[PDB]
């Protein structure tokens with residue numbers, strides 16, 4: 242009678258930790274959700290084969306609205322697992338589900354997995370230098386989210402990097418590309434004119450982290466906004482003040498313009 | 507011709523990903539470094555038995571200085587694995603190793619694993635709300651670092667949470683406890699008088715992240731400074747402004763005082 246939150250990792254079924262796999266193999270029921278992120282290198286069938294269990298996929302509504310009516314009842318009499326892409330508690334609201342579990346008298350444990358939040362280290366940007374993070378959300382009809390613009394501005398004033406999670410509408414198979422994110426940001430810039438995100442802004446794009454051959458690119462918006470970074474998922478980063486070692490890596494590994502090596506002090 | 511940077515994860519030998527383990531098992535040579543961080547819940551022997559390959563441990567100098575003299579020459583003609591605690595490249599110096607590999611004409615790939623940066627999500631605090639991060643280091647001789655104090659100040663001023671890594675005597679396997687960190691912070695507060703860290707400051711302690719039985723506690727410094735949080739490692743977090751779900755999680759899961767529920771959003 243327990244509930245395991247288990248992360249599946251960044252890209253494919255092998256991104257789960259050994260700990261996660263062995264525990265999942267011992268569970269009576271295995272649930273999962275694939276709406277918080279996209280695992281571009283695998284399929285539900287491959288994950289099921291690896292774990293050797295049939296997986297019950299839940300929709301956002303199943304979870305947010307009925308987690309305690311679908312999953313918790315079973316966890317009271319069986320060992321249950323709830324799988325999620327990346328790390329289960331990063332850039333999701335699944336942490337709140339641990340409260341529902343507790344109040345239902347169900348013990349829960351968390352098994353971590355690689356997350357895009359730390360995988361950004363592969364960009365060469367100092368991870369301790371990132372400030373507040375935000376999500377570039379899809380406009381919805383007349384509704385046009387812009388709060389993430391203010392996040393970049395706040396971090397930039399402090400010389401900190403900004404990690405921009407890109408939106409995803411799994412049920413509509415909508416996965417925001419770094420290009421779309423840049424386009425939206427430029428539109429927000431035209432509205433706010435804060436001089437935060439322009440054609441001359443240096444950005445970093447990381448696509449399909451977790452794969453052996455992810456796309457890591459750095460350059461000015463005007464040059465990357467029309468570049469093909471490959472299939473999603475994508476994350477966008479707006480660096481703050483670059484240190485020489487960060488610039489060196491972006492140039493050597495991400496093909497950034499050599500001119501960024503000449504940092505401004 | 508290939509060099510694999512493989513992360514070992516948070517706590518023990520099972521924290522490596524399936525992908526990382528399977529790749530390591532296929533390598534001709536396997537190196538490991540335990541000077542940037544440590545695997546508190548395991549030993550070199552257990553990691554070695556899990557992979558089934560002999561593992562050669564490298565010192566700080568072996569890597570920082572002679573990486574190209576020890577590892578790269580072998581990577582030129584063989585498949586080589588370089589194991590590191592946590593997630594590869596989260597450690598700042600590791601990024602340049604990829605450049606050295608490139609310079610030496612050796613291909614390198616990164617196999618991610620869980621890192622504290624993403625694992626702190628288990629504290630129930632929103633990952634988006636974390637600001638700049640810092641490390642609390644042992645004062646030694648005529649060196650008493652205090653910059654981490656200013657990081658907290660700047661983050662808190664913006665309502666952001668502050669992730670504080672605690673110092674470690676890598677070679678000696680000696681860890682700074684959350685208790686010692688609180689002591690130091692209270693001392694820095696005395697010589698800073700910024701009202702940033704006091705007996706009434708709410709803090710969160712995360713012990714042994716990655717283990718199946720981590721300790722997660724939250725409360726005011728005055729009440730937690732002398733509490734036993736169990737074996738290391740310990741991570742300290744100074745929350746900024748909480749929203750109600752973060753507060754509820756801390757109360758329900760971390761045993762925080764009900765007082766914190768009067769959030770200030």
Ligand SMILES: Nc1ncnc2c1ncn2[C@@H]1O[C@H](CSCC[C@H](N)C(=O)O)[C@@H](O)[C@H]1O
Nearest residue numbers: 251278327328331356357407449450474475
């Ligand atoms: N492997 C990956 N590569 C690049 N971006 C990724 C990624 N994983 C997810 N993302 C980005 O982040 C969004 C999901 S946010 C939730 C992520 C997950 N909990 C984790 O720990 O990784 C996606 O819409 C995408 O923009």
